[PDB]
Symmetry: C2
Subunit: 252 residues, 2 copies
């Protein structure tokens, strides 16, 4: 088991061509709808299916079978992305191909900056057999724009875009620490394309750059890809009855 | 559950104890009977802890379990282990130690030594040792000063550049934001500059412990580093000779 070392999922993300990635919120989207969606994501050629939410409860019982249902519907890697909780670390279920581990470098709480990683690894392997664990994608996670929800939960402070001083410190850490990926997120605004470009230029060639938050159109996906993103995530755009139309346009 | 990476009894002692010298015994060089003699004197001098440390080691567990037990039987001071990690194993550990000092080599060009050694170590926990019996972990930023091809070849470190404070300021932002417990400034072949010690003391939080070591052989040097803000001044080599009791009195006096 690679665990924190590069594995199959990271290799796939590094080698696949850049593009959109749909994020299914498993605590909002019924499993039957996730399964329908998963079949389309495969046809569209996305690199992976992310299951992610800021909120969760009864994680293991809900997610082990949710992950299994999704994997029965798509051959694409299923990657989990959820915040950690003191006393438990990051949530995990057997069957997931990988867990995205966000180190919230802009947080004022050292638990969310990185000690969550120590609690998670201490608890490993736990109830899940060693060879069956998901791979761990070590990720620098940064938040943009006003966001009191993530701020109250995780201690994050919006990254300053007044200059490159803060961002450059995060790039030095991303590189020296050997992180696998950088995830740029905005809950309420949009990550600036200029920031995406700055990150693509400052990161090593094998470091994967994800951007998400309020992406609702194919034009936005193209703009972020043109700015250097490897993957552009989107969740909310498909949380409605007419999601097939929306998905076609965002991917089109 | 064991405090592990959370602050525990050893960190509280290091935070609260009067600043001063700390003798470091290299257990792979110093015979255990001599370590026990030394431990008794360290206790009388009221040092904060006894560090057992070496750059080199082999057969760690069979050598160190009884060595640590002998030293613990000779002093009530906490016994702290400090050794480099090895890929595939992480940091070495034995039961009975009070704490392991975990160095994150922020100046290394190898990400394993920068911090992935911590992930390998915690993944392996609890391993062969019962959870309640594990040592506490002191999360430490470790930096090297001066030419040192030995640590460079072994761990990938590059000497910290003091031509500006840019590099150390980035390490201080990490030490603070990541909530490290301690910072360890080391020079294998030279001396950490007292002005760098002052820079770190001024930039760290009040609860972050600052250790300096490397070629400390006189009481004057200990005083200069304490005056500069070091919480602890480590010294090993000065006592690796027959006349160590005289050397110890001069360094601690
Ligand atoms: C803060 C952070 C990056 C990591 C900490 C862990 C954490 C809070 C993980 C949850 C996943 C996440 C970052 C945001 C939630 O929704 C968006 C899609 O947004 P849209 O509906 O606008 O398309 C997504 O999953 O990307
Ligand atoms: C490079 C680093 C700080 C950590 C990585 C792990 C590592 C190499 C740990 C071994 C302990 C160490 C840092 C130096 C060895 O001797 C000195 C004192 O020297 P003196 O004989 O000159 O008094 C000591 O133990 O401090
Ligand atoms: Mg473990």
């Amino acid at each position: 088991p690679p665990l924190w070392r590069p594995g199959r999922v990271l290799a796939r993300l590094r080698e696949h061509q850049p593009g959109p990635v749909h994020i299914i919120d498993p605590f909002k989207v019924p499993v039957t709808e996730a399964v329908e969606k998963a079949a389309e994501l495969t046809r569209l050629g996305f690199a992976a299916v992310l299951l992610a939410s800021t909120d969760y409860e009864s994680f293991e019982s809900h997610m082990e079978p949710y992950v299994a249902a999704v994997k029965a519907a798509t051959p694409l890697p299923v990657v989990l992305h959820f915040p950690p909780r003191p006393g438990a670390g990051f949530p995990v279920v057997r069957g997931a191909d990988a867990l995205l581990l966000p180190a919230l470098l802009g947080s004022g709480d050292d638990y969310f900056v990185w000690k969550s990683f120590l609690e998670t690894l201490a608890a490993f392997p736990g109830r899940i057999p060693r060879e069956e664990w998901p791979e761990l994608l070590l990720t620098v996670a940064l938040t943009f724009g006003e966001d009191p929800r993530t701020g109250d939960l995780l201690g994050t402070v919006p990254v300053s875009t007044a200059s490159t001083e803060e961002i450059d410190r995060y790039l030095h850490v991303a590189r020296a620490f050997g992180f696998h990926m950088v995830y740029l997120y905005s809950r309420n605004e949009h990550v600036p394309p200029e920031v995406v470009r700055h990150f693509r230029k400052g990161l090593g060639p094998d470091q994967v750059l994800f951007v998400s938050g309020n992406v609702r159109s194919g034009r936005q996906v193209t703009e972020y890809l043109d700015s250097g993103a490897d993957y552009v995530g989107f969740a909310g755009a498909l949380e409605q009855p007419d999601w097939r139309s929306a998905l076609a346009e965002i991917a089109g």
